[PDB]
């Protein structure tokens, strides 16, 4: 990753709190000044936190893709240590959608999902199994591009594929199950999967052949595709590259989205 000089960064406002310290909006001067998010490492970090902190930047720095958060660079030689990324104005996806409930077209929602899916196709090609794909780990920018975020060395049962739970077998097909749950998150404008059901109920339903119900006004193709992501046998779930392609068909022929799922 790129080491950058404290002089080029200027923190402006706190916009959040992370595992290792507060996160700020700011300005990077690489000439020309550009908004950035800035993750700080609290003074008083342990060695373990230092390594986990810089490590995420390391993992992130191995990626270059439109729908993957871009590491601008780290600050590891001076204090506050920082991780500098592209600024995403609309913040986390689940929270954004909750604030803008019913305010997007079905095409804007599906395009958000194709962005995510694309990023997950990139990750899956790089052999990177995210393990924690969820709408809260997607960030969104002024133009509504959704980027997979949160790469890092805690994972809730109900975003997780049954085989990944019972045998702890995490693959890219595990992530595809999670992506179906994100689809339901996006199409319900940020509702919590399985509402207030307990982890126990949730696994009993899933193993009993029962799935999350169709979101209100959900296109039939979007609902069926999520049901394709929630097949008990992972080998039958679509791969991310199938998902991207199906969502592109749907976007290219938007009248496909006029027919809704029922019941
Ligand atoms: N690149 C970014 N651009 C814009 N906002 C960001 C960026 N990264 C993080 N944030 C914001 O800062 C918050 C905390 O960042 P992050 O560490 O990535 O999430 P977290 O540790 O899971 N904590 P939280 O999201 O508050 O539950 C997020 O909710 C975002 O609102």
Curated annotation (Swiss-Prot):
Phosphotyrosine carried by residues: 24, 128
- What induces the gene encoding this protein? Up-regulated by UV irradiation via a TP53-independent, MAPK-dependent mechanism.
Q: Where is the active site?
A: 132 (proton acceptor)
Residue ranges annotated for the Protein kinase domain, each copy included: 9-251
What is this protein's gene name? EPHA2
Tissue-specific expression:
Expressed in brain and glioma tissue and glioma cell lines (at protein level). Expressed most highly in tissues that contain a high proportion of epithelial cells, e.g. skin, intestine, lung, and ovary.
Q: Where is this region: Mediates interaction with ARHGEF16 and ELMO2?
A: 2-263
Q: Which residues carry this modification: Phosphoserine?
A: 245
Primary role: Receptor tyrosine kinase which binds promiscuously membrane-bound ephrin-A family ligands residing on adjacent cells, leading to contact-dependent bidirectional signaling into neighboring cells. The signaling pathway downstream of the receptor is referred to as forward signaling while the signaling pathway downstream of the ephrin ligand is referred to as reverse signaling. Activated by the ligand ephrin-A1/EFNA1 regulates migration, integrin-mediated adhesion, proliferation and differentiation of cells.
Which residues lie toward the Cytoplasmic compartment? Answer: 1-263
Q: How does it assemble?
A: Homodimer. Interacts with SLA. Interacts (phosphorylated form) with VAV2, VAV3 and PI3-kinase p85 subunit (PIK3R1, PIK3R2 or PIK3R3); critical for the EFNA1-induced activation of RAC1 which stimulates cell migration. Interacts with INPPL1; regulates activated EPHA2 endocytosis and degradation. Interacts (inactivated form) with PTK2/FAK1 and interacts (EFNA1 ligand-activated form) with PTPN11; regulates integrin-mediated adhesion. Interacts with ARHGEF16, DOCK4 and ELMO2; mediates ligand-independent activation of RAC1 which stimulates cell migration. (Microbial infection) Interacts with human herpes virus 8/HHV-8 glycoprotein L/gL and glycoprotein H/gH heterodimer; this interaction triggers EPHA2 phosphorylation and endocytosis, allowing virus entry.
Q: Which residues are reported to carry the modification Phosphothreonine? A: 40
**What does the entry list as the binding residues for ATP?**
15-23, 39
**PTM:** Autophosphorylates. Phosphorylated on tyrosine upon binding and activation by EFNA1. These phosphorylated residues are critical for recruitment of VAV2 and VAV3 and PI3-kinase p85 subunit which transduce downstream signaling to activate RAC1 GTPase and cell migration.
Protein name in UniProt: Ephrin type-A receptor 2
Source organism superkingdom: Eukaryota
The condition associated with this protein in its record is: Cataract 6, multiple types: An opacification of the crystalline lens of the eye that frequently results in visual impairment or blindness. Opacities vary in morphology, are often confined to a portion of the lens, and may be static or progressive. CTRCT6 includes posterior polar and age-related cortical cataracts, among others. Posterior polar cataract is a subcapsular opacity, usually disk-shaped, located at the back of the lens. Age-related cortical cataract is a developmental punctate opacity restricted to the cortex. Overexpressed in several cancer types and promotes malignancy.
Family to which the UniProt record says this protein belongs: Belongs to the protein kinase superfamily. Tyr protein kinase family. Ephrin receptor subfamily.
Q: Can you say where in the cell this protein is located?
A: Cell membrane; Cell projection, Ruffle membrane; Cell projection, Lamellipodium membrane; Cell junction, Focal adhesion
